């Protein structure tokens, strides 16, 4: 499924992600924007032998598992495919759990430099809610 700026802002609010542990929607949208562009289908691949599924992209080796990743640990205790549900609730639930290890979002390549050091308004400007 796909999530628009205000749709995602409303969903992120219903989930309690805005300012969650300080992570404002600007961080979430900026990250999701270049990562999957607010999409519950955009998947990515890693050479180590893993794959990432979920709107915010979640690797099936350290964050989740899909049952096909050639050797995966799974720290979210959740099935990767579920991160592609029509509701961000799946990924937000695992994200709200993963963002509590110690590294938080200091891993996602997009947020790491495109957001963790840029701006957090261009991803919310407009959805003033």
PDB file of C-alpha atoms in Angstrom:
ATOM      1  CA  UNK A   1       0.000   0.000   0.000  1.00  0.00           C
ATOM      2  CA  UNK A   2       1.155   3.661  -0.298  1.00  0.00           C
ATOM      3  CA  UNK A   3       1.005   6.433   2.353  1.00  0.00           C
ATOM      4  CA  UNK A   4       0.698  10.176   1.509  1.00  0.00           C
ATOM      5  CA  UNK A   5       2.297  12.937   3.650  1.00  0.00           C
ATOM      6  CA  UNK A   6      -0.899  13.746   5.620  1.00  0.00           C
ATOM      7  CA  UNK A   7      -2.082  10.115   5.537  1.00  0.00           C
ATOM      8  CA  UNK A   8       1.302   9.055   6.979  1.00  0.00           C
ATOM      9  CA  UNK A   9       1.282  12.035   9.432  1.00  0.00           C
ATOM     10  CA  UNK A  10      -2.215  11.009  10.642  1.00  0.00           C
ATOM     11  CA  UNK A  11      -1.185   7.328  10.835  1.00  0.00           C
ATOM     12  CA  UNK A  12       2.112   8.189  12.588  1.00  0.00           C
ATOM     13  CA  UNK A  13       0.032  10.240  15.080  1.00  0.00           C
ATOM     14  CA  UNK A  14      -2.533   7.469  15.715  1.00  0.00           C
ATOM     15  CA  UNK A  15       0.488   5.222  16.378  1.00  0.00           C
ATOM     16  CA  UNK A  16       2.137   7.799  18.643  1.00  0.00           C
ATOM     17  CA  UNK A  17       5.271   8.148  16.466  1.00  0.00           C
ATOM     18  CA  UNK A  18       5.356  11.967  16.290  1.00  0.00           C
ATOM     19  CA  UNK A  19       8.094  12.972  18.777  1.00  0.00           C
ATOM     20  CA  UNK A  20       8.199   9.319  19.851  1.00  0.00           C
ATOM     21  CA  UNK A  21      11.260   9.265  22.134  1.00  0.00           C
ATOM     22  CA  UNK A  22      11.941  12.623  20.389  1.00  0.00           C
ATOM     23  CA  UNK A  23      11.735  11.174  16.842  1.00  0.00           C
ATOM     24  CA  UNK A  24       9.439  13.834  15.290  1.00  0.00           C
ATOM     25  CA  UNK A  25       7.465  12.984  12.093  1.00  0.00           C
ATOM     26  CA  UNK A  26      10.135  15.025  10.218  1.00  0.00           C
ATOM     27  CA  UNK A  27      12.677  12.306  11.077  1.00  0.00           C
ATOM     28  CA  UNK A  28      10.234   9.519  10.224  1.00  0.00           C
ATOM     29  CA  UNK A  29       9.028  11.115   6.934  1.00  0.00           C
ATOM     30  CA  UNK A  30      12.548  12.204   5.828  1.00  0.00           C
ATOM     31  CA  UNK A  31      13.783   8.642   6.496  1.00  0.00           C
ATOM     32  CA  UNK A  32      10.745   6.941   4.901  1.00  0.00           C
ATOM     33  CA  UNK A  33      10.796   9.434   1.976  1.00  0.00           C
ATOM     34  CA  UNK A  34      14.163   8.469   0.435  1.00  0.00           C
ATOM     35  CA  UNK A  35      14.023   4.937   1.903  1.00  0.00           C
ATOM     36  CA  UNK A  36      10.682   3.671   0.455  1.00  0.00           C
ATOM     37  CA  UNK A  37       8.884   6.955  -0.383  1.00  0.00           C
ATOM     38  CA  UNK A  38       6.071   6.036   2.077  1.00  0.00           C
ATOM     39  CA  UNK A  39       5.362   2.636   0.434  1.00  0.00           C
ATOM     40  CA  UNK A  40       4.499  -0.735   2.103  1.00  0.00           C
ATOM     41  CA  UNK A  41       5.966  -2.627  -0.900  1.00  0.00           C
ATOM     42  CA  UNK A  42       9.344  -1.034  -1.787  1.00  0.00           C
ATOM     43  CA  UNK A  43      11.841  -3.790  -0.827  1.00  0.00           C
ATOM     44  CA  UNK A  44      15.670  -3.542  -0.757  1.00  0.00           C
ATOM     45  CA  UNK A  45      18.525  -6.121  -0.877  1.00  0.00           C
ATOM     46  CA  UNK A  46      21.819  -6.499   1.067  1.00  0.00           C
ATOM     47  CA  UNK A  47      24.925  -8.331  -0.209  1.00  0.00           C
ATOM     48  CA  UNK A  48      25.782  -9.915   3.188  1.00  0.00           C
ATOM     49  CA  UNK A  49      22.865 -12.266   2.384  1.00  0.00           C
ATOM     50  CA  UNK A  50      19.787 -10.457   3.722  1.00  0.00           C
ATOM     51  CA  UNK A  51      16.855  -8.327   2.540  1.00  0.00           C
ATOM     52  CA  UNK A  52      14.854  -5.412   3.972  1.00  0.00           C
ATOM     53  CA  UNK A  53      11.042  -5.277   3.969  1.00  0.00           C
ATOM     54  CA  UNK A  54       8.660  -2.683   5.522  1.00  0.00           C
ATOM     55  CA  UNK A  55       7.835   0.967   4.644  1.00  0.00           C
ATOM     56  CA  UNK A  56      10.845   2.190   6.703  1.00  0.00           C
ATOM     57  CA  UNK A  57      13.009  -0.681   5.326  1.00  0.00           C
ATOM     58  CA  UNK A  58      13.925  -3.303   7.963  1.00  0.00           C
ATOM     59  CA  UNK A  59      16.772  -5.784   7.302  1.00  0.00           C
ATOM     60  CA  UNK A  60      15.751  -9.454   7.755  1.00  0.00           C
ATOM     61  CA  UNK A  61      19.080 -10.280   9.464  1.00  0.00           C
ATOM     62  CA  UNK A  62      19.334  -7.866  12.430  1.00  0.00           C
ATOM     63  CA  UNK A  63      15.849  -6.272  12.599  1.00  0.00           C
ATOM     64  CA  UNK A  64      13.354  -8.915  11.306  1.00  0.00           C
ATOM     65  CA  UNK A  65      13.228 -12.254   9.413  1.00  0.00           C
ATOM     66  CA  UNK A  66      11.395 -13.539   6.305  1.00  0.00           C
ATOM     67  CA  UNK A  67      12.166 -17.296   6.476  1.00  0.00           C
ATOM     68  CA  UNK A  68      14.394 -17.135   3.360  1.00  0.00           C
ATOM     69  CA  UNK A  69      17.275 -14.918   4.566  1.00  0.00           C
ATOM     70  CA  UNK A  70      20.362 -17.237   4.495  1.00  0.00           C
ATOM     71  CA  UNK A  71      20.976 -17.070   8.285  1.00  0.00           C
ATOM     72  CA  UNK A  72      19.131 -14.307  10.189  1.00  0.00           C
ATOM     73  CA  UNK A  73      18.996 -13.359  13.911  1.00  0.00           C
ATOM     74  CA  UNK A  74      15.849 -11.169  14.263  1.00  0.00           C
ATOM     75  CA  UNK A  75      15.950  -8.626  17.112  1.00  0.00           C
ATOM     76  CA  UNK A  76      12.365  -7.452  16.589  1.00  0.00           C
ATOM     77  CA  UNK A  77      10.883 -10.975  16.958  1.00  0.00           C
ATOM     78  CA  UNK A  78       8.555 -10.125  14.038  1.00  0.00           C
ATOM     79  CA  UNK A  79       8.056 -11.475  10.455  1.00  0.00           C
ATOM     80  CA  UNK A  80       9.444  -9.091   7.780  1.00  0.00           C
ATOM     81  CA  UNK A  81       6.534  -9.697   5.342  1.00  0.00           C
ATOM     82  CA  UNK A  82       4.174  -8.301   8.048  1.00  0.00           C
ATOM     83  CA  UNK A  83       6.024  -4.972   7.677  1.00  0.00           C
ATOM     84  CA  UNK A  84       4.300  -4.637   4.255  1.00  0.00           C
ATOM     85  CA  UNK A  85       0.732  -4.572   5.674  1.00  0.00           C
ATOM     86  CA  UNK A  86      -1.747  -2.016   4.307  1.00  0.00           C
ATOM     87  CA  UNK A  87      -1.277  -0.210   7.672  1.00  0.00           C
ATOM     88  CA  UNK A  88       2.055   1.275   8.864  1.00  0.00           C
ATOM     89  CA  UNK A  89       0.948  -0.167  12.234  1.00  0.00           C
ATOM     90  CA  UNK A  90       3.028  -3.303  11.511  1.00  0.00           C
ATOM     91  CA  UNK A  91       6.313  -1.451  10.833  1.00  0.00           C
ATOM     92  CA  UNK A  92       5.573   1.300  13.410  1.00  0.00           C
ATOM     93  CA  UNK A  93       5.055  -1.433  16.060  1.00  0.00           C
ATOM     94  CA  UNK A  94       8.420  -3.061  15.246  1.00  0.00           C
ATOM     95  CA  UNK A  95      10.026   0.391  14.798  1.00  0.00           C
ATOM     96  CA  UNK A  96       8.682   1.566  18.188  1.00  0.00           C
ATOM     97  CA  UNK A  97      10.334  -1.594  19.590  1.00  0.00           C
ATOM     98  CA  UNK A  98      13.573  -1.466  17.560  1.00  0.00           C
ATOM     99  CA  UNK A  99      14.018   2.269  18.376  1.00  0.00           C
ATOM    100  CA  UNK A 100      14.810   1.138  21.941  1.00  0.00           C
ATOM    101  CA  UNK A 101      17.972  -0.973  21.560  1.00  0.00           C
ATOM    102  CA  UNK A 102      20.586   1.775  21.895  1.00  0.00           C
ATOM    103  CA  UNK A 103      21.409   2.637  18.276  1.00  0.00           C
ATOM    104  CA  UNK A 104      17.825   3.747  17.528  1.00  0.00           C
ATOM    105  CA  UNK A 105      17.786   5.048  13.933  1.00  0.00           C
ATOM    106  CA  UNK A 106      21.591   5.513  13.775  1.00  0.00           C
ATOM    107  CA  UNK A 107      21.598   2.780  11.110  1.00  0.00           C
ATOM    108  CA  UNK A 108      19.175   3.560   8.229  1.00  0.00           C
ATOM    109  CA  UNK A 109      21.392   5.032   5.467  1.00  0.00           C
ATOM    110  CA  UNK A 110      18.820   7.714   4.441  1.00  0.00           C
ATOM    111  CA  UNK A 111      18.044   9.089   7.942  1.00  0.00           C
ATOM    112  CA  UNK A 112      21.724   8.683   9.006  1.00  0.00           C
ATOM    113  CA  UNK A 113      22.851  11.642   6.789  1.00  0.00           C
ATOM    114  CA  UNK A 114      19.874  12.873   4.729  1.00  0.00           C
ATOM    115  CA  UNK A 115      17.917  13.547   7.946  1.00  0.00           C
ATOM    116  CA  UNK A 116      20.137  13.110  11.040  1.00  0.00           C
ATOM    117  CA  UNK A 117      21.888  16.407  10.160  1.00  0.00           C
ATOM    118  CA  UNK A 118      19.646  18.165   7.575  1.00  0.00           C
ATOM    119  CA  UNK A 119      16.082  19.460   8.214  1.00  0.00           C
ATOM    120  CA  UNK A 120      12.973  17.982   9.877  1.00  0.00           C
ATOM    121  CA  UNK A 121      10.311  20.366   8.468  1.00  0.00           C
ATOM    122  CA  UNK A 122      10.359  19.737   4.688  1.00  0.00           C
ATOM    123  CA  UNK A 123       8.909  16.291   5.574  1.00  0.00           C
ATOM    124  CA  UNK A 124       5.930  17.696   7.533  1.00  0.00           C
ATOM    125  CA  UNK A 125       5.414  21.274   6.246  1.00  0.00           C
ATOM    126  CA  UNK A 126       1.697  21.372   5.294  1.00  0.00           C
ATOM    127  CA  UNK A 127       0.300  18.451   7.327  1.00  0.00           C
ATOM    128  CA  UNK A 128       0.050  20.905  10.250  1.00  0.00           C
ATOM    129  CA  UNK A 129      -1.528  18.197  12.371  1.00  0.00           C
TER     130      UNK A 129
END
